[PDB]
C-alpha cells in the first residue's frame, strides 16, 4: 500500500470499417512519501481496468529517492524525447512548484521543497518519463566518493 495518485486518463481511438474502437490510458504514480515512488502506464479497454493495471506496472517500476529533509541533493536537467525537465534544490518553507505531473511524482516521493521548470515538449507522458529518469540519476556524497575511490 502506497499513496498512489493518478495523473491523467485518456481515450485513444483506433479505426476499423465499422467505426472507431476505444482504448484507455491511465498514467499513475504510486509512492510512500518516504523516498520510494514508481511510474506506471496502463492501457486497457475500460477505465477502472487500465488504472488498476497502471498500479501493477507502477509498483513493478519504482525508484529510490535520496532526500535531505524533503528535497533533492543537487540539480539535474533531463531530456526525454523532446520533453525536458529541470530539478533544482530548495530550502524548507518553499513547497513543490511544478505542473500536476511532475508535482504528483515528487509529492509521493516525500519531497516538500524543490524547484522545477518544464522546457521542451510539455507532453505529460514524456514529461513523466523524463522525471523518473532524472531521479534515476540522483546521488549523495556517499554515491560520489564510493565512485571516486581509486
Amino acid at each position: 500500500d502506497f499513496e498512489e495518485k493518478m495523473i491523467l486518463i485518456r481515450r485513444t481511438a483506433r479505426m476499423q470499417a465499422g467505426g472507431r474502437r476505444f482504448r484507455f490510458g491511465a498514467l499513475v504514480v504510486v509512492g510512500d512519501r518516504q523516498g520510494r515512488v514508481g511510474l506506471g502506464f496502463g492501457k486497457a479497454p475500460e477505465v477502472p481496468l487500465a488504472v488498476q493495471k497502471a498500479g501493477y506496472y507502477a509498483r513493478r517500476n519504482m525508484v529510490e529517492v535520496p532526500l535531505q529533509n524533503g528535497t533533492i541533493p543537487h540539480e539535474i536537467e533531463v531530456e526525454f524525447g523532446a520533453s525536458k525537465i529541470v530539478l533544482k534544490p530548495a530550502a524548507p518553507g518553499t513547497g513543490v512548484i511544478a505542473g500536476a505531473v511532475p508535482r504528483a511524482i515528487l509529492e509521493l516521493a516525500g519531497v516538500t521543497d524543490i524547484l522545477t521548470k518544464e522546457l521542451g515538449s510539455r507532453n505529460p507522458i514524456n514529461i513523466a518519463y523524463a522525471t523518473m529518469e532524472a531521479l534515476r540519476q540522483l546521488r549523495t556524497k556517499a554515491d560520489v566518493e564510493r565512485l571516486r575511490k581509486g
Binding site: P92, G93, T94, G95, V96, I97, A100, T112
Partner: protein, 208 residues
Amino acid sequence: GRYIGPVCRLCRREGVKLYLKGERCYSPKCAMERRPYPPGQHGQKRARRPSDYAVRLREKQKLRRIYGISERQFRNLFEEASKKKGVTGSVFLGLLESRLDNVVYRLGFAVSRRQARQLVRHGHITVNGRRVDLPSYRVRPGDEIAVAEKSRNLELIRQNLEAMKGRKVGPWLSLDVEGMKGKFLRLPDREDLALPVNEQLVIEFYSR
C-alpha cells in the same frame, strides 16, 4: 469587509467545521452536525474529483475564513512572510496570529473572532496601558493585553473569562485571569497551532 451574512454555512461548504459562531458551532448543531454537505440546491450529490486548483483554492479560503479576513489583507500578510527569512508557513501564521482581534480570541476575552473584533474596535481592549481599537494591530513580544477600565464592568467579558478560569492558553501566550490582563510571550511556532489546514497548499495556491 469582515464577511457578514450566513456563517455556520462556511462552518459547512469546506466541510471541516469552523468554529465561526463560537458557542453554537460547539453545540450539537453548528448546522454542521445536522446537514453535513454543501449549501444550496445540490449539496448532497455525487461529489466530483476536485482539480488540483480546487484543492489549493479550497485550502486557502478555509484558512482565510477562520480568521475572517479580507483577501486583500490576507494576501498582504502572505507576501510579507514570503519576502522574509524563516519558513514562510510558520512565519505567516505567526503574523496572522499576532493580530489583535485574534489574540483577544486566543486569550479568551471573546467567544468568537468576530465577537473579539467588535470589542477591539469599541476600545474595550487596551495595550501596555494605552487603549486601542484597530483589529489589524500586530502584537509584539512582552505586551500586556489588558481590558480597559470602562470595559471591566460587563456581563459579556465575565462569562467569557468565566469558562477560561483554569483552562489553557497557547504556550506562547499568558493570561492573568483575575485582572483581565495577559501577555503575548513570543511568536507562535508552527507546532503550537492546530488549525485544519495543510498550509503548504496555501503557499502553492499563491505560486499561480
